């Protein structure tokens, strides 16, 4: 049961890191495009 | 026991990815601000 609870919590952690990576990808893409346009 | 050891190691991996995401967030923010200031 502790292991099940650990995996559950770790899945939440993973989802948070996915959110973060998606945010950063959009932001760096926006910067790359800004520099290209300039 | 193998599963416990796997979860332990995976938690270390997750912590490393969190470190990396935090580094990248600060770096892209620094770049965004640099461009704004310029």
């Amino acid at each position: 049961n502790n292991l099940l609870r650990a995996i559950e919590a770790q899945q939440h952690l993973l989802q948070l890191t996915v959110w973060g990576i998606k945010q950063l990808q959009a932001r760096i893409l926006a910067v790359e495009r800004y520099l290209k346009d300039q | 026991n193998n599963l416990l050891r796997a979860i332990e190691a995976q938690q270390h991996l997750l912590q490393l990815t969190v470190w990396g995401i935090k580094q990248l967030q600060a770096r892209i923010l620094a770049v965004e601000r640099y461009l704004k200031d310029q």
């Binding site: 650990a6 919590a9 952690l13 959110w19 | 416990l4 938690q11 969190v18």
Partner: peptide, 28 residues
Amino acid sequence: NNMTWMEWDREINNYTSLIHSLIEESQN
């Protein structure tokens, strides 16, 4: 949605602390 980087930090830390406890309790 409502997610901000400070909230992200908070939630990461809370889940990490819980997992540490769960893994340790299992050590026992």
